[PDB]
Amino acid sequence: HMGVRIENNLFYVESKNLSLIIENRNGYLLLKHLGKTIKNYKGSNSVYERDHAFSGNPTATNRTFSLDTQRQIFGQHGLGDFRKPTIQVQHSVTEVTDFRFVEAKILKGQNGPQGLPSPHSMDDTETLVLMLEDSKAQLSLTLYYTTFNNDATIASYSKLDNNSNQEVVIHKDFSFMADFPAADYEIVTLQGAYAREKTVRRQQVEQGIFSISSNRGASGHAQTPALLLCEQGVTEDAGNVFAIQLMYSGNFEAFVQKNQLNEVRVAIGINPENFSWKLAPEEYFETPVALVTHSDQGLTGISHESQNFVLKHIMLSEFSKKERPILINNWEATYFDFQREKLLELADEAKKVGIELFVLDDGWFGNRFDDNRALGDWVVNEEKLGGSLESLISAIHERGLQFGLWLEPEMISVDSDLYRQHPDWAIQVPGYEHTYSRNQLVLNLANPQVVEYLKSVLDQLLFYHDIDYIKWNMNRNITKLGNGLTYLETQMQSHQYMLGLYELVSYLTEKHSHILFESCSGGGGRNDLGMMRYFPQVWASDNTDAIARLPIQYGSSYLYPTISMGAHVSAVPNHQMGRMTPLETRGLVAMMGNLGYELDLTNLSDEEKATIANQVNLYKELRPVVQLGQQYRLINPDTVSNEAAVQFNYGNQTIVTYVRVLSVVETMETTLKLKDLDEEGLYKLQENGEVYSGAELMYAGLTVILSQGDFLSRQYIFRKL
Amino acid sequence: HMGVRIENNLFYVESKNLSLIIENRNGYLLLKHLGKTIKNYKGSNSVYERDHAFSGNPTATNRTFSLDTQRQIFGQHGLGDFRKPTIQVQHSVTEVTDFRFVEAKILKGQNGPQGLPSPHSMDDTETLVLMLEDSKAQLSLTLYYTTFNNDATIASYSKLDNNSNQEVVIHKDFSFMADFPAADYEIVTLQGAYAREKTVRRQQVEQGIFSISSNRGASGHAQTPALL
Amino acid sequence: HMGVRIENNLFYVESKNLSLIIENRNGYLLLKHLGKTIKNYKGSNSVYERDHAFSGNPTATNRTFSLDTQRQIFGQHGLGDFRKPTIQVQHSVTEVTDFRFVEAKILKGQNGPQGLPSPHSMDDTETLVLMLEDSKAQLSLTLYYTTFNNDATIASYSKLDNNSNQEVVIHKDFSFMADFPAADYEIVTLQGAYAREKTVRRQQVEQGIFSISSNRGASGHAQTPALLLCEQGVTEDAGNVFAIQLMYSGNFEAFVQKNQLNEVRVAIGINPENFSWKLAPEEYFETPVALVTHSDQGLTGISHESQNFVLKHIMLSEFSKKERPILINNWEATYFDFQREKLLELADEAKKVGIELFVLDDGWFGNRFDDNRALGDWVVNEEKLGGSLESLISAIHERGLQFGLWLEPEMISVDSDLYRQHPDWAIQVPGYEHTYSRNQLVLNLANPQVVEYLKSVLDQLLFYHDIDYIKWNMNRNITKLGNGLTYLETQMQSHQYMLGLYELVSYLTEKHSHILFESCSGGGGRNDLGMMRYFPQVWASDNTDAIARLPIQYGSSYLYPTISMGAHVSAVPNHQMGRMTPLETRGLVAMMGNLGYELDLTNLSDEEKATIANQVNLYKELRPVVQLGQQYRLINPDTVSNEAAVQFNYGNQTIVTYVRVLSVVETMETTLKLKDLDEEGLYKLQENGEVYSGAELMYAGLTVILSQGDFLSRQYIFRKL
Ligand SMILES: OC[C@H]1O[C@H](O[C@@H]2[C@@H](O)[C@@H](O)O[C@H](CO)[C@@H]2O)[C@H](O)[C@@H](O)[C@H]1O
Ligand SMILES: OC[C@H]1O[C@H](O[C@@H]2[C@@H](O)[C@@H](O)O[C@H](CO)[C@@H]2O)[C@H](O)[C@@H](O)[C@H]1O
Ligand SMILES: OC[C@H]1O[C@H](O[C@@H]2[C@@H](O)[C@@H](O)O[C@H](CO)[C@@H]2O)[C@H](O)[C@@H](O)[C@H]1O
Ligand SMILES: OC[C@H]1O[C@H](O[C@@H]2[C@@H](O)[C@H](O)O[C@H](CO)[C@@H]2O)[C@H](O)[C@@H](O)[C@H]1O
Ligand SMILES: OC[C@H]1O[C@H](O[C@@H]2[C@@H](O)[C@H](O)O[C@H](CO)[C@@H]2O)[C@H](O)[C@@H](O)[C@H]1O
């Protein structure tokens, strides 16, 4: 049985194959167990209470009880625990609180923080409600833990109520924390950089504090809101992993602290940097949702658990199991230099090769002839489009293609009518020059007038035009915070910006629910689970190099389903890397993702056109396997590997893609073994017609043969008989 | 020769076998070299200035100058550098400052922060005084770097003056910072515990942030104020 | 289905969950697969045949077939393969052979090399017989591979027949070889030293050749005839392991070679060093049996597979499931300084504490008052024993104890009547002084007169005396080889020594099958599967320190069952380490093995006596769990670990022993999780009466609490309800 149970002083939060067991000890909440299901928990792994030097106590006479040494589910500073705190509220002359458990409730079905992205499809869930109070400060903190009956994930968030007669200020308020017992641990995170997104990083947990964080106002290219605490020696196939993740797209921190006793604290939430939150009497603050996910089946186990939870409970139901259109995007194809003739000719070529959707990228609005002006001016450039957008769309529709359109609503150019009319709408500090980034500024979405304006302009665009798809961009990070009437309002504006964004995108995605919205932030600059609540695919990276895409796709699909992961076949030499790669390899690499095209089809040879038509035909066949199937990493593209290989299973279809980076000589061929087949199953390999048992493919494997050369690839396609 | 030298837009802080060479670039202070003595420094290891995506700029038209990518000796938040800041002062409705170099002085002999433990036997020392101002906020930040003639050590501290007509609040103010060029590095620290003090720890520098800290009101058994 | 199958040009050798699939390619035998079961093998992992530079060919015109690049099951030198060979026979002017497959047969039921220890209980086995011939040299090589229906092990050996009209000389003849595909591999071996036996070593496979070997004439303290080739990243719980082992107790080699293409060869057999073997026309040579064992369940998987195979098919049926007596041995207790009074008084004390068997150690024979004389003179010293051995034995029997006796049959002292009568019986070289070791010499057991003499003297000792147990010692290694009438006979004498030993011990153990024979060689100097065919327990180490015993027991039980592993509680300060350890810890450590006692019980306090009586009572209870149960390593004692923990399961009994080496301070308690329990099972912990689900014990685990101090231990005893 799954759900929530209250049994004497234990609370059991029971998801599928994952339990959190909390003990109420005289108002203090102790983490007894987080991990595989245990019923009738007795306490075999309880903390041994002893006098630990310099670890102090809530009472004078009992030296062996200390919040410095108890395992907890939230952290305070000032009561004897010196580990990093996760709740810290200023009230009167102090930022000491002492929240004590008073009452527990259980909810059933949907719930979550208002104004923030949270799980859906929650009918078969229960939520533990732990009501804590600080009687002196007259504050309440309420913790929520939600079970899921179909996934090894628990969701968490909290609400802080000010029940006092004075203003209070939240300084720290994370979404999840767990104290894990001293043991050897490794951590996996996804970091990297622009054009190197979601680089998989693994390291040993060491004494001290390790953290990843964004202070950019977006989660960022260089860190993902995820931290995987792993059993020493974890592999793809074996060992315990706990993934903590955050459904938030602004400033966040994830940290792991190893203290003086070798104990380990992990937490994730809103970054303390650039954050404070004023609460007037009777006001409350709810944190974004955190997730804790578990597998005992290594890193592939955690990928599957995380992907499944995302597909079922985050990504929009309307799209989570819907094959996504193969698109053409004109950006790398033309940049800003296009007009109607060029567009329809590209559309003609796209239709001939069987592409499904035509996306008009940057440059269609205002006087956007380059990237130095016009953001904020969402007026159609009818001169450039050679008539109305309506007439363009009709043209695209009549050629048999869906129509998509680029927006960047959060941004404003100094050189724009919007800025001329409302210069105060930009994020800025009185008496300081702007800081520029791609020669543009960020709109203050903490300003309700800004949100109202964007809802209006965009609702107008979407209702008056037959648009099938939106690409929602965001091309710089936030500087010069000073739009508040007070310092505290400025400290709130980064989170209020996010609330404004979510109000905006939840409104539009809900009001226009037939439209496929793809998120973007110079590629993967905001590829997190907050955005994926509303945008069921993401432009994974501006780097469209087939080879540079290998580690990027590795990371981008590590916790997120492949279906989310936009990938385009682009021109050579590649625009980012300056590299020639075979068209075959560009195709096979993009086909490990959500396939599209981004090159000038009108300038290709007849042969290159035929190749792309063949690629499109192939992917129409593989699309369900890739987008709806189960992903298995076989060879990981990292810093030292010269190879990449990824398998997908879906019913009677099994495919495997193999890529080799550098040509090798006098080196024995790799043996590549498949996973998760029926030993007794019979698998017919398309290329040679041979039938192999699943046992053979899994335990003997394929001798991988290639010619001489860099960046070569091949694909194996099997049908189970 | 050891001591402090000011030469066009370079400042040389020269201790025995250790130099800090700082460049004034239009009010921004750049760390050019920290390490073994170099005279007549030309800039072989200067940062190559290019357009780095999402690294923003103090002017609209120059995309290749960014405090996100320049090596510095103190860190601010809000001007395009997103690395962890080491000075952050709230004033009026903001905690954005933009301290710009205005003037350099050189002291000889003893000096240090009042009320805090500082080096003694300083007769053969010189101190570089880098006076920075935020004209809008009406704040001064003054950086001090002191040479020693008999040791490969440089000492540092700073003073922040409120020259405005309103209260201001310091939120962050570290004593030393250096941006080192991308390379492979390890770190050594002394941590441990009560009855296990100053345990020597060594690890690889990894992407992200590693820290040791005390919030105990004392430096503590489990971490020493040192990082190698 | 298991057994052997011949299907066109494939041969399938099918044990439980392990298959060897060999292809006959025009007389050459190719290793197609060794690993998990595959039926209907097609060849997905076949070698890709290409022209590899400097890899030559059996025909002029086909450059892509080369024995330098094909994966094989035996290795020759001179036909284009430059990997280390495993068969090399001199004939006429050459040591080039070219053995070609001619015919295959299948046997059922028992078979093995004559004169060498081989598996028993073989009714449900089949043996593939691969008959190879070199027509020019007129030699036959016949390879045997045997399946087992109840274990993931295949056994192998070969026979070489000289069918020519001239003498031939074998230079190399290993017992097993496999070419494994290029991949990342680690190897585990057991090495160490005297008083540090079976130290577990793990390392990466590197280009070049790694080997362990003995040239000592015994397998030796410092290397065990075992090599585990492991999947990169193997753990206790997960990953593929292939263990190759040799049932031989003389000179051996195991090697792993990584060649120029990254391919990996492994082999084990008689060491080429100190070996040559002359065959006259019509003579044949059979190699010792090698074993290849597989698990995909990590290192605990391989331990279980290896232990099970040993228990079922090597260790004597009469003893493999028989609880072994708790003994007292007087060696550390008295050394050579004893007589009848002392012996019976020790026997009295042993009986009071419930000990079962009394073993009389060195010094009872000839004029053996120290270790400088009398080896070879197996005459009872009736003066020292205060009457006949018969009268001593009766005395011991009447006190309720079984009687055991020390022998060292393979050795002779210069100062002995045996040496005075037959100086030529010693291993020696004409015209060279002896090399001495513990001031004794080795008997030439290659001399049939020596074997006849020992059979006679010992048969006499055993038939005329009511002995329940023998401790068979061997206290030096072999030097000064030169007893041959020719150089070639000398080159044969080390292997003939072993044949002589096995003839001797198979005879006596068979003719006196009620007697428990424990093997010994200054502790673990010859603790291998050759000896374990006849001697169902072994003195694991002269090091009886509780703490030094930790890594020793780790290694000694790594591939061999716990029941084999002699372990004695001894006096403090310990005689080897100069160390004080708690009597409790000495007890608990020895109780992880086959328990006995080796200290002067007559000199203990009343309290120390009561403690030992308590230990004996406890072990009488734990003995089936330890000796007959399943072993699970929980914390391994290695160079860096400060801890050791080992679990045993047997029906409704689960025990766990924990030892900490150095005292620690301000360090959080270890969390120790149990393995292989029923999640839903209820487990009652004896010490506190608490009942824990198996899920709790396995997934939460025990907080391990100890006082301050070095070398402390504790045991947890559970009963499943
Ligand atoms: O749910 C826990 C809190 O409930 C009460 O306040 C809530 C408030 O948080 C918000 O949900 O608005 C509703 C509307 O009725 C309630 O006022 C308590 O005041 C808090 O102390 C806390 O228990
Ligand atoms: O030294 C740099 C600063 O100097 C001036 O102020 C100092 C003040 O810091 C303190 O040292 O007290 C002395 C006493 O005269 C001076 O007032 C400037 O006001 C600062 O702006 C700054 O330049
Ligand atoms: O079993 C393979 C060999 O069989 C023949 O010789 C055997 C010999 O090895 C030994 O087993 O003694 C028996 C007794 O009859 C046989 O002679 C062949 O001579 C060998 O060539 C080889 O086939
Ligand atoms: O402007 C259209 C373009 O926007 C985003 O990419 C850009 C990139 O082309 C430019 O070189 O740099 C900025 C940041 O400096 C952005 O990363 C989209 O990601 C891209 O797909 C395209 O739509
Ligand atoms: O002599 C009896 C003794 O023989 C073996 O051990 C000895 C050891 O006591 C002595 O110190 O060294 C030699 C080698 O130099 C042997 O290792 C047995 O192993 C021991 O149990 C005892 O029976």
Please give the full DSSP string across A63-77, using - where no structure is assigned: SS--TTTS-BSS--S
Region label for A587, one of left (φ > 0), alpha (ψ between -120 and 50) or beta (otherwise): alpha
Evaluate whether A532 touches A556 at the Cβ level (below 8 Å).
no
Q: For residue A223, how many C-alpha atoms fall within 13 Å in the half-sphere facing its CB?
A: 29
* Pairwise CA distance, residues C580 & C586, whole Å: 10
Question: Ligand 2 pocket, B131 CB below 6 A?
Answer: yes
Q: Which residue of A has its CA nearest to C688?
A: A44
Q: Which residue has the tokens 């936009």?
A: A566
Ligand 2 atom showing the smallest separation from residue B133 Cα: 21
Both tokens of B113, joined, read 């922060």
Q: Which residue has the tokens 């004590």?
A: A100
Evaluate whether C285 touches C501 at the Cβ level (below 8 Å).
no
| Total H helices, total E strands in chain A | 12, 38
Evaluate whether C106 touches C129 at the Cβ level (below 8 Å).
yes
* Pairwise CA distance, residues C24 & C8, whole Å: 9
Element (H, E) at C549: helix C549-556
DSSP one-letter string for B134-190: ETTTTEEEEEEEE--SSSS--EEEEEEEE-SSS--EEEEE-S---PPPSS--EEEEE
Backbone dihedral angles phi then psi of residue C648, each to the nearest 5 degrees: -125, 135
Peptide bond before residue A573 is cis, with ω within 30 degrees of 0: yes
* Pairwise CA distance, residues C712 & C398, whole Å: 38
Both tokens of C585, joined, read 């810890």
Residue C411: how many CB atoms within 10 A of its CB?
A: 21
Residue type, A282: E
The vertex-C399 CA angle with C397 and C400, nearest 5°, equals 65
Name which of A302, A296, A180 is nearest C679 in CA terms.
A296
* Pairwise CA distance, residues C478 & A81, whole Å: 66
Rg over CA atoms, chain A? 27
Residue B95: how many CB atoms within 10 A of its CB?
A: 25
A residues 231..250 contacting C (CB < 8 A): 233, 235, 237-239
Ligand 5 atom showing the smallest separation from residue C406 Cα: 23
Write the burial class of residue C94 (CB in 10 Å: 0-12 exposed, 13-18 middle, 19+ buried): exposed
Parallel, antiparallel, or unpaired: how do β-strands C87-90 and C168-180 relate?
Answer: antiparallel
Experimental technique: X-ray
Residue B31: how many CB atoms within 10 A of its CB?
A: 20
In the beta sheet, which residues pair with residue C210? C256
Residue type, A240: N
* Pairwise CA distance, residues C16 & C150, whole Å: 6
B residues 14..33 contacting A (CB < 8 A): none
The vertex-A247 CA angle with A539 and A533, nearest 5°, equals 55
* Residue boundaries of the structural domains of chain A: 1-304, 305-626, 627-721
Q: Measured between CB atoms, which of C44, C695, C705 is closest to A37?
A: C695
* Pairwise CA distance, residues C361 & C542, whole Å: 13
Tell me how close the Cα of A93 comes to any Cα of chain B, in angstroms.
16
Q: Which residue has the tokens 């406890």?
A: C618
| Total H helices, total E strands in chain C | 12, 38
- Regarding the domain with residue range C1-304, which homologous superfamily does it belong to in the CATH classification? alpha-galactosidase from lactobacil brevis (2.70.98.60)
- The 8-class DSSP code of residue A86 comes to S
Question: Ligand 3 pocket, C129 CB below 6 A?
Answer: no
Evaluate whether A719 touches A683 at the Cβ level (below 8 Å).
yes
Q: Which residue of C has its CA nearest to B193?
A: C666
Helix C340-352 × helix C606-628 angle, to 10°: 70
B92 interfacial to chain A (CB closer than 8 Å): yes
Residue C431: how many CB atoms within 10 A of its CB?
A: 6
Region label for A12, one of left (φ > 0), alpha (ψ between -120 and 50) or beta (otherwise): beta
* Pairwise CA distance, residues B34 & B11, whole Å: 12
> Is A608 tagged catalytic?
yes
Name which of C11, C244, C16, C286 is nearest C124 in CA terms.
C16
Distances (CA, A) of C434 to C216, C491, C596: 16, 19, 37
* Pairwise CA distance, residues C507 & C314, whole Å: 16
Please identify every residue of C annotated as catalytic.
528, 608
Q: Measured between CB atoms, which of B54, B79, B221 is closest to A260?
A: B221
Topology classification of domain A305-626: TIM Barrel (3.20.20)
In the beta sheet, which residues pair with residue B190? B200
Q: For residue C533, how many C-alpha atoms fall within 13 Å in the half-sphere facing its CB?
A: 22
Both tokens of C682, joined, read 């209820």
Burial C436-468 (b: 16+ CB within 10 A, else e): eeeebbbbbbbbeebbebbbebbeebbeeeebb
Residue B161: how many CB atoms within 10 A of its CB?
A: 13
Q: Which residues contact A494 (CB under 8 A, 6 or more apart)?
A: A217, A250, A251, A274, A275, A446, A478, A481
Q: How many residues does chain C have?
A: 721
Residue type, B33: H
Parallel, antiparallel, or unpaired: how do β-strands A357-360 and A402-407 relate?
Answer: parallel
Ligand 5 site residues, Cβ closer than 6 angstroms? C 331, 361-362, 371, 406, 438, 473, 475, 520, 522-523, 539, 542
SS in 3 state form for C309-350? HHHHHCCCHHHHCCCCCCEEECHHHHCCCCCHHHHHHHHHHH
Marked catalytic residue, from A528, A542, A643, A696: A528
Burial C195-211 (b: 16+ CB within 10 A, else e): bbbbbbeeeebeeeebe
Parallel, antiparallel, or unpaired: how do β-strands A469-472 and A402-407 relate?
Answer: parallel
Backbone dihedral angles phi then psi of residue A214, each to the nearest 5 degrees: -120, 135
Residue A382: how many CB atoms within 10 A of its CB?
A: 15
* Pairwise CA distance, residues C168 & C158, whole Å: 17
What ranges make up the beta strands (E) of chain B?
3-7, 10-15, 18-25, 28-35, 87-90, 100-108, 126-134, 139-146, 155-162, 169-173, 186-193, 196-204, 209-211
* Pairwise CA distance, residues A151 & A125, whole Å: 11
Q: Which residue has the tokens 């390879």?
A: C143
Name which of A247, A242, A240 is nearest A155 in CA terms.
A247
Q: Which residues contact A267 (CB under 8 A, 6 or more apart)?
A: A75, A84, A86, A174, A176, A177, A178, A244, A253, A254, A255
Nearest residue by C-alpha to atom 18 in ligand 5: C522
Evaluate whether A425 touches A410 at the Cβ level (below 8 Å).
no
* Pairwise CA distance, residues A568 & A551, whole Å: 15
Backbone dihedral angles phi then psi of residue C621, each to the nearest 5 degrees: -80, -40
Name which of C384, C354, C357, C408 is nearest C522 in CA terms.
C408
A684 interfacial to chain B (CB closer than 8 Å): no
Backbone dihedral angles phi then psi of residue A621, each to the nearest 5 degrees: -80, -40
* Pairwise CA distance, residues C524 & A357, whole Å: 75
Tell me how close the Cα of A357 comes to any Cα of chain B, in angstroms.
28
Burial B75-87 (b: 16+ CB within 10 A, else e): bbbbbbbbbbbbb
Name which of A490, A586, A592, A482 is nearest A544 in CA terms.
A586
Alpha carbon B70 to its chain's center = 13
Q: How many residues does chain B have?
A: 228
Evaluate whether C31 touches C71 at the Cβ level (below 8 Å).
yes
Name which of A157, A199, A159, A205 is nearest A182 in CA terms.
A205
Contacts of B195 in chain A (CB under 8 A): 53
Q: Which residues contact A405 (CB under 8 A, 6 or more apart)?
A: A359, A360, A364, A461, A465, A467, A469, A470, A471
Resolution of this deposited model, Å = 2.0
Closest-approaching ligand to the CA atom of B141: 2
Tell me how close the Cα of C699 comes to any Cα of chain B, in angstroms.
29
The vertex-A519 CA angle with A518 and A524, nearest 5°, equals 125
Parallel, antiparallel, or unpaired: how do β-strands A126-134 and A100-108 relate?
Answer: antiparallel
Evaluate whether A190 touches A282 at the Cβ level (below 8 Å).
no
Nearest residue by C-alpha to atom 18 in ligand 1: A161
In the beta sheet, which residues pair with residue A682? A693
How many angstroms is it from A280 CA to the middle of ligand 1?
Answer: 14
- Edge-to-edge strands of the sheet including A691-693? A630-635, A643-650, A653-660, A712-720, A682-685, A691-693
Contacts of C235 in chain A (CB under 8 A): 233, 235, 238-239
Contacts of A669 in chain C (CB under 8 A): 48, 182
How many angstroms is it from C542 CA to the middle of ligand 5?
Answer: 7
Name which of A226, A229, A266 is nearest A246 in CA terms.
A226
SS3 C132: strand
Evaluate whether A178 touches A100 at the Cβ level (below 8 Å).
no
Give Dmax over CA atoms of chain B in angstroms: 59
* Pairwise CA distance, residues C428 & C318, whole Å: 38
> Is A382 tagged catalytic?
no
Name which of C260, B187, B66 is nearest A210 in CA terms.
B187
* Pairwise CA distance, residues C185 & C234, whole Å: 9
Nearest residue by C-alpha to atom 17 in ligand 4: A522
Tell me how close the Cα of C18 comes to any Cα of chain A, in angstroms.
11
SS3 C11: strand
* Pairwise CA distance, residues C226 & C38, whole Å: 26
Both tokens of C381, joined, read 């010293």
Q: For residue C352, how many C-alpha atoms fall within 13 Å in the half-sphere facing its CB?
A: 15
Q: Which chains touch C (3 or more CB pairs under 8 A)?
A: A, B
DSSP one-letter string for A299-359: HHHHHHHHHHHHHHHTS-HHHHTSPPPPEEE-HHHHTT---HHHHHHHHHHHHHTT--EEE
C641 interfacial to chain A (CB closer than 8 Å): no
- The 8-class DSSP code of residue C423 comes to G
Do residue B95 and residue A485 have CB atoms under 8 angstroms apart? no
Q: Which residue has the tokens 């030169």?
A: C482
SS3 C610: helix
Q: Which residues contact C404 (CB under 8 A, 6 or more apart)?
A: C327, C329, C357, C358, C359, C360, C467, C468, C469, C470, C471, C516
In the beta sheet, which residues pair with residue A230? A186, A241
Torsion of CA B91, B86, B150, B104, to 10 degrees: -40
Torsion of CA A495, A499, A505, A507, to 10 degrees: 180
Name which of B150, B116, B112 is nearest B129 in CA terms.
B112
SS3 A497: helix
B215 interfacial to chain A (CB closer than 8 Å): yes
Q: Which residue of C has its CA nearest to B194?
A: C666
Nearest residue by C-alpha to atom 18 in ligand 4: A522
Peptide bond before residue C573 is cis, with ω within 30 degrees of 0: yes
SS3 A532: helix
Evaluate whether A607 touches A601 at the Cβ level (below 8 Å).
no
Do residue B53 and residue A485 have CB atoms under 8 angstroms apart? no
Parallel, antiparallel, or unpaired: how do β-strands A671-672 and A277-279 relate?
Answer: unpaired
Evaluate whether A98 touches A108 at the Cβ level (below 8 Å).
no
Topology classification of domain B1-228: Beta-galactosidase; Chain A, domain 5 (2.70.98)
Residue type, B195: A
* Pairwise CA distance, residues C5 & C21, whole Å: 10
What ranges make up the beta strands (E) of A166-274?
168-180, 185-193, 196-204, 208-213, 226-231, 241-246, 252-258, 264-270
* Pairwise CA distance, residues A661 & A640, whole Å: 11
Closest-approaching ligand to the CA atom of C113: 3
For ligand 5, mutation pick of C539, C542, C543 (most atoms within 8 Å of CB) = C542
A627-721 belongs to which CATH class? mainly beta
* Pairwise CA distance, residues A79 & C522, whole Å: 61
Name which of C36, C275, C91 is nearest C174 in CA terms.
C275
Q: How many residues does chain A have?
A: 721
Both tokens of C420, joined, read 């005075």
Tell me how close the Cα of B153 comes to any Cα of chain A, in angstroms.
26
Evaluate whether C652 touches C681 at the Cβ level (below 8 Å).
no
Q: Which residue of A has its CA nearest to C47?
A: A703
Do residue C703 and residue A42 have CB atoms under 8 angstroms apart? no
Burial C289-313 (b: 16+ CB within 10 A, else e): bbbbbbbbbbbbbbbbbbbbbbbbb
Evaluate whether C350 touches C597 at the Cβ level (below 8 Å).
yes
Both tokens of C116, joined, read 């060498």
Residue type, B183: A
Parallel, antiparallel, or unpaired: how do β-strands A153-162 and A290-295 relate?
Answer: antiparallel
